[PDB]
Design an enzyme around this catalytic site. Structure first.
Site, PDB file in Angstrom:
ATOM      1  N   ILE A 128       0.907  -1.154   0.000  1.00  0.00           N
ATOM      2  CA  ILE A 128       0.000   0.000   0.000  1.00  0.00           C
ATOM      3  C   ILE A 128       0.934   1.189   0.000  1.00  0.00           C
ATOM      4  CG2 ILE A 128      -1.723   1.513   1.102  1.00  0.00           C
ATOM      5  CD1 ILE A 128      -2.801  -1.177   2.499  1.00  0.00           C
TER       6      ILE A 128
ATOM      7  N   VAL B 299       0.832   5.615  -0.613  1.00  0.00           N
ATOM      8  CA  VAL B 299       0.152   6.885  -0.866  1.00  0.00           C
ATOM      9  C   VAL B 299       1.269   7.901  -1.104  1.00  0.00           C
ATOM     10  CG1 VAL B 299      -1.344   8.679   0.133  1.00  0.00           C
ATOM     11  CG2 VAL B 299      -1.856   6.262   0.518  1.00  0.00           C
TER      12      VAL B 299
ATOM     13  N   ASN C  78       6.268   0.455  13.800  1.00  0.00           N
ATOM     14  CA  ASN C  78       5.194   1.352  13.380  1.00  0.00           C
ATOM     15  C   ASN C  78       4.042   1.187  14.391  1.00  0.00           C
ATOM     16  OD1 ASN C  78       3.453   3.033  11.973  1.00  0.00           O
ATOM     17  ND2 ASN C  78       3.575   1.917  10.028  1.00  0.00           N
TER      18      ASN C  78
ATOM     19  N   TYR D 274      -4.613  -1.042  13.580  1.00  0.00           N
ATOM     20  CA  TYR D 274      -5.018  -2.384  13.157  1.00  0.00           C
ATOM     21  C   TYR D 274      -5.686  -3.165  14.276  1.00  0.00           C
ATOM     22  CZ  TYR D 274      -1.915  -1.451   9.147  1.00  0.00           C
ATOM     23  OH  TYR D 274      -1.323  -0.892   8.049  1.00  0.00           O
TER      24      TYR D 274
END
Lengths: 214, 214
Positions: free
Chosen positions: A140, A142, A179, A186
């Protein structure tokens, strides 16, 4: 709440299936992801390589990419690449307008202000215990002008909703152990971190050596 | 070395592609794997589910299973399920003969003493940075009478050799962080453990909840 005025600086988003026409945008997003992850020495992707390998099966049968596009105006709503998918849309209230100087390299047309802002690459995995396919999210990403606005989680939710629509058993992905903010997000959505699992990789010369052992 | 006599208790092995006829053996191997891993509450696999989901693509396009069969006699050498694969064979010198009382449940024919001893389930994954597919190993299981004889590593080597044959960029799999002996064996063959990576899973009620969020 008496709110007449539209939001200041609205941004419209659409998540759609990537098709072969999107190969240059996928290539450029991967190159930016290599720069972001500090893994540029590993980058050897080409447009011809992506074209040759990403579309050998139908969408959702193997490698599948969803692209996130953004626009300062609503999307006007060609047949979809799959009978099992229709694009997702969302309206975002940005605090400030976005400055994206590289928008010319990520514009499929440009005359309608449609800019590719990110992607998710995924494919079917399998649960032996359920005898059911799932989806594994490989990447993923961005682009920097669009980070910290919830777009990465929207790409993840697109895959999770596709799994439910298809009757699939699991959605899996990797998070970096440090992270901490992503881990908490999550856990909040009900995902479990498989604490005991470590990923092994055989590649390069070590993988090539298997050609000789018989 | 003047060695005339054949080895005592030889065992012949063959690794081949699973076909739909092998579904009952795959189902029974998965059930034994659930008992072995202490994950029996998760076991809901059926023959119909495996038949319905494992063969929707060609071998190596998506879910692929290699089966390991063993025999006390050499295999006599039907068209293969793939043009890209031919079975692997190996002769093993066992210290003692193997006692396998459940061999009747794992015999495709039985009149030729061919017994299914294990399997590997894998499928193509992808490296964005290389623009190349790879293989991800989901599960490797060897039945208890055949463990500690090198059969699990032979199933792993079968996948690695298939990746090289197909021009694929990586072979990936998971190891339990406390399985120190497997970790050292993987490091010896040149595999790298991706230390920072943690696997996340969204399943059950948490995954089902994505049907509602829009």
């Amino acid at each position: 709440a008496p709110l007449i005025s539209p939001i200041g600086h609205p941004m419209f988003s659409r998540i759609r299936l990537a098709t072969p026409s999107d190969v240059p945008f996928i290539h450029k997003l991967i190159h930016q992801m290599a720069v972001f992850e500090r893994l540029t020495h590993l980058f050897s992707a080409t447009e011809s390589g992506l074209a040759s390998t990403l579309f050998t099966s139908r969408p959702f049968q193997s490698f599948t990419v969803f692209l996130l596009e953004v626009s300062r105006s609503p999307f006007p709503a060609t047949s979809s690449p799959s009978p099992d998918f229709t694009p997702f849309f969302k309206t975002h209230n940005l605090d400030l307008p976005i400055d994206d100087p590289e928008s010319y390299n990520f514009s499929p047309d440009m005359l309608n202000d449609v800019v590719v802002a990110g992607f998710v690459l995924f494919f079917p995995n399998y649960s032996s215990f359920l005898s059911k396919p799932g989806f594994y999210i490989e990447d993923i990403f961005v682009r920097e002008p669009y980070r910290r606005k919830g777009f990465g989680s929207m790409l993840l939710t697109a895959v999770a909703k596709q799994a439910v629509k298809m009757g699939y058993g699991r959605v899996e992905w990797v998070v970096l152990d440090w992270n901490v903010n992503a881990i908490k997000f999550y856990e909040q959505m009900g995902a479990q971190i498989l604490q005991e699992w470590r990923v092994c990789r055989l590649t390069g010369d070590a993988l090539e050596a298997f050609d000789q052992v018989n």
